[PDB]
DNA sequence: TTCTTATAAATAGTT
DNA sequence: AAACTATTTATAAGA
DNA sequence: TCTTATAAATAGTT
DNA sequence: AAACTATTTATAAGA
DNA sequence: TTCTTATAAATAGTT
DNA sequence: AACTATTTATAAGA
């Protein structure tokens, strides 16, 4: 961007909205590419600050989510805290 | 004089009590008869011996209601998560059912 | 990258697997950034080609999906084809 | 009191209730004083006629119940019938 | 009593025990009377300073203990501090 | 078998022990086959004449019992009485 | 039967229910004969693929479950995986 | 004891 | 559920 | 231990 | 709902 | 909401 | 993995 931004909440309401929409599309585009490049299945669920829902899936959403509930082995599970630590080492 | 049903629930409740104590006990010289054996079982965090399945049994009974986001009871937090997962699964199967009832008509 | 690629399945196993790990991290990174910058909750579920689970959620995964199951209003739901179309338009 | 009463269920609803609250405090007072005077641990559990719970403890209730559960020696245990006979012999 | 006693730990072990025994018996008599007069279920557990157990239950102890572990709503829970406050107000 | 036997208590101790070990194994085999064939969760608890415990569970005994205790809806329950009558109908 | 079947999940729902009803009675009948012939207490709990409950017990179910819970001794415990090995090693 | 066999009992397939 | 059978499986005895 | 003078709890009522 | 007080009850100190 | 583009961020192919 | 040359994303202002 014209300027680097830090990853902390955007306080200007207008700006935050413009950013959500633009970065949300960019996220879905990356997810689409990952699903095609590497033959995988992806479901993405996003609730904005007003609790409106936005969603993407490379196949039927409900099937991916059921497959998640049926999974029973340890596996990579990241959260906002986890990813913070990870970047701090790198 | 209590029904075998109540009496089994009481027995499970007491085992639970015993497990939640041994989970938070830092007193190496504890005088509670079951503490030592129980702390030994808990220390089966070695992953893998005395089956961990027995322990997860008790935790399950416990997990039904341990509310603190930070229980020290082996597996509690994990079991609470799997119970939410299961609840999600029912919801998904229901919605899926409805879409097909609608589709088949 | 050193070279532009087409979004088509990567057939070489080593390349596919290296690309997966890398881009999966990149997608989680962007999801993290979107949830912090714009104050939203996000769930991301990925199954790789061998049906192994990788996941990320801003807050508790199950709570977001639960909230998802309660939604009952029309909303943006995108698939691979919708994204291809949006890409072509530009 | 103004009059001596018999230890028998109080029939009048209003009397029973008022007496219940008064004597209950009196019992907790006595348990409080005993715990301090004699340095002991006391748990008191009371269900009323309409099955509401009232509890008193001079220390953590759950620790007292667990020590009780594992107490593995003969000890004094009284019931109502026991106490009746104990006073009958005076 | 032949004199008022303050509510403070009795230092003399013999006197501590003598006081314990009288007041223990007095507490169980009061509890007995409460349960009869007001038709309620009461359990009383007492460990003395040398950790000997003394117990009273109007009806069976295990029964009252089961119901107690099952109770899952608001109920008054009192401690020594709680009783001291109530005493002071007067 | 070489001959048909009547369904009534085996009075010869040795003969009763032999039969028990054999049929116990058959009963467990049948339980195993039903849970695999029909995708179900089964628990079998057996106390023999000398009061020893033998158990089968398709995966975990305590998971079934837990699910048993929480189940609250009319269900087929059969006793020796119920089963005799169904066998006589035939 | 007309044809030997392999012990693997029956995938067709109608056929699975046919075999289930049939084999469940067979199982409950074997359990009954075992209990009478050899004088044991038996409890059997079955959840089918759609989580409906069926149960048998030679006596009161609750009595059997209590006796199980309070048994504190090593004892034979078989699982589907166990019984697989024993059968394979032949 | 463990290990056959002859048979009784169960069940798959099909109505 | 309830009929058939034809086969297979379990198991009382015999080895 | 069993008493006794004296403190404390409390039934009826206000 | 808490307050009064005439009684009844509990119990401290001492045999 | 778009667009423009300077600049930051991601990542394909190389070591 | 670790490193870069290059492609892709996007922040700010119009
Ligand atoms: Zn301890
Ligand atoms: Zn283990
Ligand atoms: Zn817990």
XYZ file of C-alpha atoms (C1' of nucleotides) and ligand atoms in Angstrom:
736
model
C 0.000 0.000 0.000
C 1.032 3.648 -0.200
C 1.900 3.211 3.465
C 2.529 0.269 5.729
C -0.211 -0.361 8.263
C 0.024 -2.194 11.552
C -2.357 -5.028 12.374
C -4.542 -3.302 14.981
C -8.226 -2.358 14.805
C -9.101 0.247 12.201
C -10.867 3.061 14.026
C -12.285 5.104 11.141
C -15.675 3.523 10.332
C -15.691 4.297 6.601
C -12.126 3.138 6.133
C -12.793 -0.014 8.081
C -15.676 -0.939 5.778
C -13.746 -0.293 2.558
C -10.937 -2.417 3.968
C -13.241 -5.290 5.011
C -14.769 -5.637 1.571
C -11.468 -5.394 -0.297
C -9.543 -7.739 1.992
C -12.457 -10.189 2.211
C -12.452 -10.616 -1.556
C -8.654 -11.002 -1.471
C -9.025 -13.743 1.166
C -11.613 -15.620 -0.875
C -9.430 -15.314 -3.971
C -6.447 -16.864 -2.141
C -8.707 -19.652 -0.833
C -10.014 -20.383 -4.326
C -6.386 -20.574 -5.638
C -5.277 -22.832 -2.823
C -8.193 -25.181 -3.478
C -7.371 -25.490 -7.184
C -3.565 -25.511 -6.916
C -3.375 -28.132 -4.229
C -6.609 -30.093 -4.732
C -8.081 -29.344 -1.323
C -11.425 -28.393 0.202
C -11.882 -25.132 2.011
C -14.733 -23.485 3.816
C -14.470 -19.940 5.045
C -16.943 -18.239 7.342
C -16.821 -14.537 8.200
C -19.043 -12.508 10.485
C -18.444 -8.755 10.292
C -18.707 -6.383 13.279
C -22.468 -5.987 12.656
C -22.868 -9.789 12.710
C -23.617 -10.030 9.005
C -22.479 -13.338 7.468
C -20.202 -13.814 4.438
C -19.090 -17.253 3.252
C -17.047 -19.147 0.714
C -16.486 -22.819 0.101
C -14.741 -24.733 -2.683
C -17.483 -27.371 -2.408
C -20.807 -27.781 -0.606
C -20.376 -25.938 2.706
C -22.449 -28.385 4.696
C -20.326 -31.345 3.599
C -17.062 -29.703 4.630
C -18.567 -28.725 8.008
C -19.953 -32.216 8.647
C -16.513 -33.626 7.729
C -15.050 -31.298 10.357
C -17.422 -32.496 13.079
C -16.603 -36.110 12.194
C -12.837 -35.562 12.405
C -11.190 -37.211 15.396
C -7.417 -36.821 15.362
C -5.185 -34.030 16.679
C -4.523 -31.396 14.018
C -3.260 -27.859 13.412
C -5.698 -25.469 15.140
C -4.676 -21.849 15.087
C -6.286 -18.896 16.800
C -5.518 -15.185 16.785
C -3.213 -15.576 19.797
C -1.364 -18.512 18.236
C -0.630 -16.727 14.960
C 0.699 -13.695 16.775
C 3.386 -15.751 18.539
C 4.275 -17.458 15.247
C 4.976 -14.191 13.414
C 7.005 -12.844 16.367
C 9.551 -15.647 16.016
C 9.851 -15.164 12.240
C -32.126 -47.278 51.425
C -31.517 -45.298 48.220
C -32.313 -46.710 44.776
C -29.379 -48.341 42.914
C -29.734 -45.487 40.390
C -29.171 -42.716 42.962
C -26.444 -44.795 44.560
C -24.529 -45.120 41.268
C -24.777 -41.351 40.713
C -23.481 -40.706 44.226
C -20.545 -43.068 43.628
C -19.619 -41.264 40.384
C -19.985 -37.882 42.091
C -17.484 -38.992 44.790
C -14.964 -40.303 42.279
C -15.239 -36.927 40.509
C -14.633 -35.024 43.773
C -11.566 -37.163 44.278
C -10.247 -36.439 40.772
C -10.814 -32.679 40.895
C -8.858 -32.558 44.202
C -5.884 -34.587 42.944
C -5.798 -32.256 39.921
C -5.266 -29.122 41.982
C -3.277 -30.535 44.891
C 0.248 -29.117 45.273
C 0.697 -30.414 48.794
C 3.176 -33.272 48.383
C 2.317 -34.420 51.932
C -1.451 -34.627 51.458
C -3.234 -36.896 53.929
C -6.252 -37.702 51.760
C -6.308 -41.505 51.215
C -7.060 -41.358 47.478
C -4.831 -38.365 46.617
C -1.576 -40.191 45.952
C -3.040 -42.910 43.707
C -5.052 -40.304 41.835
C -2.123 -37.901 41.313
C -0.203 -40.890 39.920
C -2.983 -41.603 37.426
C -3.234 -37.949 36.427
C 0.506 -37.947 35.805
C -0.310 -40.224 32.880
C 0.106 -37.090 30.808
C 2.944 -39.210 29.382
C 0.606 -39.741 26.413
C 1.397 -43.422 25.949
C 0.191 -48.469 31.940
C -3.064 -47.856 33.921
C -5.575 -47.115 31.145
C -6.181 -43.407 30.476
C -9.639 -44.489 29.348
C -10.783 -44.926 32.949
C -9.719 -41.371 33.679
C -11.404 -39.840 30.628
C -14.518 -41.709 31.737
C -14.615 -39.711 34.996
C -13.663 -36.473 33.224
C -16.553 -36.957 30.837
C -19.014 -37.214 33.751
C -17.288 -34.145 35.181
C -17.116 -32.163 31.929
C -20.902 -32.146 31.719
C -20.746 -29.185 34.076
C -17.240 -27.873 34.797
C -17.692 -24.268 33.723
C -14.416 -22.443 34.402
C -12.681 -21.878 31.069
C -9.578 -23.214 32.835
C -10.368 -26.541 34.520
C -7.182 -28.440 35.485
C -9.003 -31.758 35.238
C -7.371 -33.878 32.538
C -9.293 -33.605 29.270
C -12.120 -31.432 30.638
C -11.452 -28.550 28.227
C -11.023 -31.058 25.416
C -14.268 -32.879 26.223
C -16.191 -29.627 26.498
C -14.996 -28.813 22.961
C -16.039 -32.204 21.592
C -19.480 -31.764 23.180
C -19.882 -28.465 21.278
C -18.651 -30.176 18.130
C -21.277 -32.904 18.580
C -23.970 -30.288 19.128
C -22.915 -28.589 15.889
C -23.089 -31.937 14.124
C -26.730 -32.458 15.143
C -27.586 -29.016 13.881
C -25.892 -29.740 10.531
C -27.680 -33.084 10.072
C -30.985 -31.424 10.880
C -30.553 -28.603 8.375
C -29.387 -31.116 5.802
C -32.396 -33.278 6.512
C -34.729 -30.255 6.000
C -33.183 -29.235 2.661
C -33.835 -32.738 1.327
C -37.395 -32.880 2.658
C -37.826 -29.598 0.799
C -36.083 -30.952 -2.284
C -37.855 -34.301 -2.511
C -41.054 -32.547 -1.420
C 7.182 -15.573 -7.453
C 10.187 -16.027 -9.781
C 7.531 -16.796 -12.393
C 3.757 -16.362 -12.860
C 1.674 -19.510 -12.543
C -1.679 -20.615 -13.860
C -4.291 -21.626 -11.333
C -4.432 -25.293 -12.290
C -3.779 -28.330 -10.149
C -0.110 -28.920 -9.348
C 0.639 -32.495 -10.440
C 4.172 -32.902 -9.014
C 3.724 -34.158 -5.429
C 6.713 -32.378 -3.852
C 5.749 -29.043 -5.399
C 2.078 -29.492 -4.544
C 2.925 -30.252 -0.906
C 5.419 -27.385 -0.447
C 2.972 -24.992 -2.134
C 0.127 -26.174 0.151
C 2.012 -25.570 3.402
C 3.230 -22.165 2.272
C -0.065 -20.872 0.899
C -2.067 -22.352 3.797
C 0.023 -20.250 6.189
C -0.440 -17.186 3.955
C -4.215 -17.660 3.957
C -4.313 -18.043 7.779
C -2.143 -14.920 8.022
C -4.580 -12.883 5.932
C -7.568 -14.253 7.844
C -5.906 -13.202 11.088
C -5.259 -9.691 9.682
C -8.852 -9.353 8.439
C -10.262 -10.293 11.849
C -8.027 -7.816 13.708
C -8.162 -4.890 11.248
C -11.894 -5.093 10.798
C -13.076 -6.609 14.083
C -14.778 -9.704 12.679
C -14.977 -13.359 13.597
C -13.663 -15.880 11.114
C -13.628 -19.683 10.773
C -11.432 -21.330 8.157
C -11.454 -25.080 7.536
C -9.078 -26.782 5.138
C -8.877 -30.442 4.082
C -5.769 -31.282 2.039
C -5.755 -33.810 -0.837
C -5.291 -36.690 1.590
C -8.221 -35.483 3.718
C -6.170 -34.199 6.678
C -7.658 -31.313 8.693
C -6.098 -27.856 9.178
C -8.066 -25.063 10.795
C -8.056 -21.503 12.009
C -10.631 -19.476 13.864
C -10.314 -15.990 15.284
C -12.153 -17.121 18.443
C -13.524 -20.581 19.369
C -14.149 -22.520 16.111
C -17.325 -24.272 17.313
C -18.892 -21.034 18.522
C -18.513 -19.441 15.116
C -20.007 -22.457 13.302
C -22.799 -22.589 15.849
C -23.565 -18.937 15.070
C -23.385 -19.892 11.411
C -26.076 -22.578 11.844
C -28.431 -19.949 13.309
C -28.172 -17.503 10.439
C -31.347 -17.195 8.412
C -31.181 -14.312 5.963
C -29.854 -14.149 2.436
C -26.131 -13.377 2.361
C -23.037 -13.521 0.206
C -22.240 -17.180 -0.473
C -19.377 -17.634 -2.920
C -18.045 -20.686 -4.759
C -15.124 -21.286 -7.111
C -17.205 -20.401 -10.172
C -18.418 -17.092 -8.717
C -14.813 -16.127 -8.029
C -13.681 -17.068 -11.518
C -16.462 -14.839 -12.915
C -15.535 -11.895 -10.720
C -11.936 -12.306 -11.842
C -12.854 -12.362 -15.530
C -14.953 -9.179 -15.301
C -11.787 -7.303 -14.276
C -40.011 -18.748 75.289
C -43.254 -17.376 76.756
C -44.485 -20.952 76.663
C -42.729 -24.302 76.479
C -43.399 -26.081 73.199
C -43.323 -29.739 72.199
C -40.813 -30.945 69.626
C -43.433 -31.887 67.061
C -44.044 -30.553 63.565
C -45.459 -27.036 63.647
C -48.824 -27.164 61.830
C -49.522 -23.439 61.295
C -47.843 -22.462 58.008
C -46.917 -18.981 59.220
C -45.552 -20.155 62.569
C -43.529 -22.916 60.910
C -41.900 -20.505 58.475
C -41.045 -17.770 60.986
C -39.782 -20.310 63.501
C -37.722 -21.922 60.714
C -35.781 -18.790 59.848
C -35.154 -17.827 63.489
C -33.994 -21.235 64.687
C -31.915 -21.595 61.516
C -29.889 -18.533 62.316
C -29.623 -19.745 65.917
C -28.168 -23.049 64.687
C -25.683 -21.304 62.419
C -24.664 -18.975 65.230
C -23.932 -21.999 67.474
C -21.951 -23.699 64.682
C -19.987 -20.551 64.047
C -19.059 -20.285 67.753
C -18.162 -23.951 67.960
C -15.850 -23.691 64.947
C -14.018 -20.754 66.492
C -14.039 -21.824 70.127
C -12.779 -25.306 69.431
C -10.947 -24.777 66.155
C -12.944 -27.234 64.116
C -14.418 -27.679 60.658
C -18.176 -27.691 60.346
C -20.499 -28.190 57.416
C -24.234 -27.719 57.822
C -26.722 -28.471 55.050
C -30.410 -27.683 55.345
C -33.329 -28.415 52.981
C -36.635 -26.823 54.067
C -40.174 -28.221 53.724
C -40.364 -26.707 50.231
C -36.923 -28.128 49.400
C -34.894 -24.901 49.269
C -31.214 -25.274 50.191
C -29.383 -23.394 52.928
C -25.782 -24.065 53.796
C -23.198 -22.993 56.323
C -19.507 -23.870 56.410
C -16.630 -22.632 58.551
C -14.207 -23.441 55.743
C -14.428 -24.703 52.124
C -17.503 -26.908 51.831
C -15.991 -29.258 49.230
C -12.870 -29.946 51.278
C -15.052 -30.826 54.268
C -17.198 -33.182 52.185
C -14.177 -34.931 50.694
C -12.490 -35.500 54.069
C -15.827 -36.921 55.236
C -16.111 -39.185 52.197
C -12.705 -40.749 52.807
C -12.881 -40.866 56.620
C -12.204 -44.524 57.338
C -12.650 -44.969 61.099
C -15.686 -45.615 63.285
C -17.229 -42.396 64.510
C -20.330 -41.056 66.175
C -23.354 -40.726 63.858
C -26.696 -39.560 65.149
C -30.146 -39.622 63.590
C -33.434 -38.237 64.827
C -34.513 -41.537 66.394
C -31.140 -41.698 68.173
C -31.521 -38.261 69.743
C -35.118 -38.865 70.833
C -34.067 -41.861 72.936
C -31.054 -39.948 74.279
C -33.346 -37.291 75.772
C -35.963 -39.888 76.772
C -33.317 -41.256 79.167
C -33.126 -37.947 81.058
C -22.781 -19.966 82.025
C -21.134 -18.951 85.310
C -19.567 -16.227 83.193
C -19.622 -14.833 79.682
C -17.023 -16.362 77.406
C -15.604 -14.498 74.439
C -15.687 -16.256 71.093
C -11.989 -16.963 70.690
C -10.069 -20.209 70.234
C -9.687 -22.012 73.565
C -5.944 -22.472 74.055
C -6.089 -25.054 76.801
C -6.512 -28.405 75.087
C -8.418 -30.010 77.995
C -10.870 -27.100 78.237
C -11.125 -26.983 74.476
C -12.284 -30.621 74.495
C -14.673 -30.216 77.383
C -16.323 -27.247 75.698
C -16.433 -29.088 72.380
C -18.338 -32.054 73.798
C -21.063 -30.029 75.486
C -21.563 -27.653 72.547
C -21.376 -30.480 69.981
C -24.255 -32.196 71.773
C -26.089 -28.868 71.998
C -25.703 -28.252 68.265
C -27.110 -31.660 67.316
C -30.027 -31.207 69.675
C -30.810 -27.850 68.029
C -30.482 -29.372 64.562
C -32.761 -32.261 65.575
C -35.402 -29.838 66.852
C -35.175 -27.684 63.745
C -35.733 -30.680 61.487
C -38.756 -31.824 63.505
C -40.421 -28.448 64.229
C -40.059 -27.246 60.674
C -40.092 -30.537 58.785
C -36.744 -30.145 57.022
C -33.760 -32.350 56.117
C -30.453 -31.497 57.779
C -26.935 -32.879 57.615
C -24.259 -31.722 60.020
C -20.592 -32.670 59.642
C -18.022 -31.745 62.312
C -14.300 -32.407 62.503
C -12.674 -31.426 65.804
C -9.181 -29.951 66.200
C -7.609 -33.424 66.316
C -9.615 -34.391 63.187
C -12.115 -36.801 64.694
C -15.446 -36.979 62.871
C -18.900 -36.445 64.394
C -21.950 -36.478 62.203
C -25.678 -35.912 62.395
C -28.369 -36.309 59.747
C -32.130 -36.079 60.329
C -32.583 -38.815 57.739
C -29.839 -40.759 55.955
C -26.558 -38.879 55.286
C -25.890 -40.225 51.755
C -29.408 -39.112 50.723
C -28.866 -35.559 51.886
C -25.408 -35.543 50.304
C -26.714 -36.739 46.912
C -29.436 -34.092 46.823
C -26.886 -31.450 47.774
C -24.455 -32.375 44.984
C -27.431 -32.248 42.588
C -28.727 -28.818 43.590
C -28.146 -26.383 40.729
C -29.718 -23.044 41.637
C -29.196 -20.045 43.950
C -29.216 -20.707 47.690
C -27.883 -18.828 50.710
C -24.288 -19.838 51.492
C -22.990 -18.587 54.810
C -19.534 -18.443 56.360
C -18.085 -17.261 59.639
C -17.513 -13.769 58.210
C -21.160 -13.770 57.017
C -22.337 -14.667 60.550
C -20.115 -12.074 62.219
C -21.587 -9.340 59.992
C -25.130 -10.358 60.823
C -24.212 -10.325 64.521
C -22.664 -6.846 64.387
C -25.624 -5.166 62.647
C -27.515 -5.872 65.869
C -24.787 -79.484 19.268
C -24.539 -83.265 19.606
C -27.885 -82.970 21.420
C -30.460 -80.283 22.200
C -30.394 -78.939 25.751
C -33.293 -77.498 27.720
C -33.061 -73.879 28.810
C -32.871 -74.320 32.589
C -30.099 -73.915 35.160
C -27.222 -76.350 34.711
C -26.973 -78.078 38.091
C -23.648 -79.879 37.459
C -20.968 -77.354 38.500
C -18.323 -78.450 35.988
C -20.746 -78.711 33.101
C -22.070 -75.228 33.970
C -18.587 -73.688 33.938
C -17.774 -75.201 30.546
C -20.993 -74.039 28.930
C -20.547 -70.534 30.373
C -17.058 -69.960 28.972
C -18.168 -71.188 25.535
C -21.451 -69.268 25.285
C -19.824 -66.156 26.754
C -17.400 -66.159 23.868
C -20.235 -66.744 21.370
C -22.326 -63.990 22.917
C -19.429 -61.563 22.633
C -18.676 -62.630 19.077
C -22.306 -62.032 18.158
C -22.163 -58.581 19.810
C -19.035 -57.703 17.854
C -20.616 -58.806 14.564
C -23.770 -56.747 15.214
C -21.865 -53.572 16.027
C -19.733 -53.851 12.860
C -22.535 -55.013 10.544
C -25.053 -52.428 11.702
C -22.769 -49.612 12.806
C -23.906 -49.601 16.417
C -22.590 -49.030 19.939
C -22.961 -51.964 22.262
C -22.118 -52.693 25.874
C -22.461 -56.099 27.499
C -22.013 -56.709 31.219
C -21.812 -60.204 32.636
C -21.597 -61.405 36.209
C -21.212 -65.177 36.481
C -22.377 -67.515 39.252
C -19.200 -67.023 41.296
C -19.792 -63.258 40.987
C -16.931 -62.333 38.603
C -17.184 -59.557 35.999
C -16.827 -60.032 32.247
C -17.423 -57.193 29.820
C -17.534 -56.233 26.189
C -17.981 -52.822 24.607
C -17.630 -52.144 20.901
C -15.244 -49.245 21.657
C -15.676 -47.845 25.196
C -17.871 -49.143 28.032
C -18.148 -45.768 29.781
C -19.139 -43.863 26.633
C -22.106 -46.178 26.134
C -23.160 -46.031 29.793
C -22.882 -42.233 29.706
C -25.065 -42.145 26.615
C -27.385 -44.591 28.368
C -27.858 -42.406 31.453
C -28.654 -39.310 29.402
C -31.136 -41.020 27.061
C -34.685 -40.016 27.998
C -37.263 -41.463 25.633
C -39.373 -44.626 25.529
C -37.305 -47.606 24.384
C -37.534 -51.373 24.046
C -36.622 -52.985 27.372
C -36.685 -56.744 27.627
C -36.323 -59.133 30.552
C -36.254 -62.903 30.675
C -40.036 -62.662 31.099
C -40.505 -60.686 27.851
C -38.189 -63.037 25.926
C -39.720 -66.307 27.088
C -43.119 -65.141 25.835
C -41.788 -64.110 22.426
C -40.094 -67.517 22.203
C -43.355 -69.312 23.050
C -45.320 -67.350 20.429
C -42.928 -69.040 17.990
C -27.702 -68.216 5.472
C -28.104 -68.740 1.708
C -24.744 -67.007 1.573
C -21.811 -66.377 3.921
C -21.411 -62.662 4.688
C -18.307 -60.708 5.617
C -18.207 -58.757 8.868
C -18.072 -55.231 7.423
C -20.599 -52.436 7.770
C -23.792 -52.992 5.775
C -24.048 -49.819 3.715
C -27.597 -50.042 2.360
C -30.031 -48.675 4.999
C -32.913 -51.070 4.341
C -30.632 -54.106 4.430
C -28.839 -52.843 7.535
C -32.198 -52.523 9.372
C -33.256 -56.005 8.191
C -30.107 -57.600 9.584
C -30.253 -55.433 12.722
C -33.785 -56.459 13.819
C -32.911 -60.090 13.114
C -29.531 -60.159 14.878
C -30.614 -58.055 17.821
C -33.226 -60.665 18.732
C -30.662 -63.408 18.209
C -28.334 -61.535 20.575
C -30.968 -60.953 23.255
C -32.004 -64.618 22.996
C -28.410 -65.829 23.453
C -28.109 -63.494 26.455
C -31.277 -64.884 28.046
C -30.105 -68.493 27.599
C -26.726 -67.639 29.075
C -28.287 -66.091 32.182
C -30.738 -68.973 32.848
C -28.369 -71.831 31.865
C -25.473 -70.562 33.944
C -27.122 -68.356 36.591
C -25.580 -64.982 35.748
C -26.703 -61.382 35.704
C -26.404 -59.872 32.252
C -26.975 -56.367 31.009
C -26.908 -55.499 27.337
C -27.169 -52.014 25.878
C -27.414 -51.306 22.116
C -27.526 -48.006 20.252
C -28.332 -48.537 16.567
C -26.968 -46.476 13.643
C -29.645 -43.838 14.193
C -29.011 -43.737 17.971
C -32.229 -45.373 19.086
C -31.773 -47.385 22.310
C -32.525 -51.047 22.934
C -31.707 -52.833 26.159
C -31.873 -56.202 27.815
C -31.065 -57.230 31.377
C -31.796 -60.488 33.216
C -32.688 -58.412 36.270
C -33.034 -54.709 37.059
C -30.688 -52.717 34.782
C -29.809 -50.178 37.504
C -28.740 -52.996 39.846
C -26.376 -54.320 37.228
C -24.869 -50.912 36.419
C -24.270 -50.261 40.153
C -22.517 -53.565 40.612
C -20.327 -52.748 37.628
C -19.404 -49.259 38.904
C -18.406 -50.553 42.332
C -16.294 -53.482 41.116
C -12.666 -52.575 41.845
C -10.778 -55.562 40.529
C -9.006 -56.526 37.302
C -11.350 -58.220 34.822
C -11.649 -59.397 31.217
C -12.573 -56.490 28.977
C -13.016 -57.009 25.254
C -13.410 -54.504 22.444
C -14.103 -54.818 18.730
C -10.381 -54.374 18.075
C -9.515 -57.095 20.632
C -11.950 -59.616 19.176
C -10.635 -58.898 15.680
C -7.117 -60.056 16.632
C -8.259 -63.187 18.417
C -10.248 -64.152 15.320
C -7.460 -63.219 12.874
C -4.933 -65.361 14.742
C -6.486 -68.548 13.323
C -7.230 -80.615 29.889
C -7.519 -79.470 24.515
C -9.430 -80.574 20.307
C -12.729 -82.697 17.138
C -17.373 -83.691 15.023
C -22.945 -84.188 14.612
C -26.073 -81.663 15.218
C -29.126 -77.891 16.744
C -29.735 -73.071 16.130
C -29.071 -68.931 13.440
C -29.315 -66.394 9.651
C -29.001 -64.641 4.465
C -31.725 -64.268 0.913
C -36.127 -63.711 -0.521
C -41.473 -63.306 -0.066
C -42.120 -57.718 12.150
C -43.442 -63.546 9.748
C -42.956 -67.309 6.350
C -39.968 -70.231 4.276
C -35.536 -72.931 3.054
C -30.231 -73.413 1.994
C -26.439 -72.657 4.106
C -23.535 -71.182 7.749
C -22.475 -70.850 12.479
C -22.379 -72.206 17.365
C -21.933 -75.555 20.544
C -22.986 -80.267 23.383
C -20.516 -84.022 23.438
C -17.256 -87.252 21.831
C -12.214 -87.914 20.807
C -18.074 -36.815 85.290
C -23.095 -33.861 87.766
C -24.436 -29.719 89.419
C -25.505 -24.388 89.657
C -25.439 -19.790 88.779
C -25.624 -17.355 85.069
C -25.786 -16.434 79.896
C -28.341 -17.201 75.773
C -32.175 -18.498 72.822
C -36.727 -18.016 71.849
C -42.490 -18.349 71.805
C -45.921 -15.457 71.888
C -47.150 -11.224 70.799
C -46.766 -6.271 69.744
C -40.296 -7.183 58.817
C -38.207 -6.466 63.194
C -38.910 -5.738 68.374
C -39.925 -6.787 73.159
C -39.605 -9.922 77.278
C -41.358 -13.636 80.138
C -39.898 -17.860 79.980
C -37.346 -21.859 78.660
C -32.849 -23.700 77.445
C -27.701 -23.986 77.171
C -23.696 -24.008 79.251
C -19.169 -22.191 82.125
C -16.844 -22.792 85.947
C -16.138 -25.850 89.744
C -16.575 -29.567 92.077
C -18.023 2.407 -4.603
C -14.302 2.670 -8.107
C -9.853 3.865 -9.840
C -4.942 4.572 -9.770
C -0.577 3.396 -8.480
C 3.362 3.640 -5.109
C 4.550 0.589 -2.029
C 4.071 -3.421 0.981
C 3.304 -8.426 1.204
C 3.309 -13.025 -0.744
C 5.370 -16.487 -2.994
C 7.754 -19.697 -7.353
C 11.740 -21.444 -8.163
C 16.319 -21.689 -6.578
C 20.077 -23.193 -3.187
C 14.229 -24.851 5.118
C 16.127 -20.505 3.724
C 16.539 -16.988 0.044
C 15.209 -13.771 -3.629
C 13.368 -12.058 -7.888
C 9.214 -11.338 -9.240
C 4.144 -11.341 -8.936
C 0.224 -9.982 -6.321
C -2.165 -7.221 -2.937
C -3.502 -3.212 -1.242
C -3.540 1.996 1.407
C -4.315 6.315 0.415
C -6.052 9.861 -2.173
C -8.779 11.369 -6.236
Zn -4.220 -34.064 47.918
Zn -2.173 -44.510 29.499
Zn -12.845 -29.552 34.559
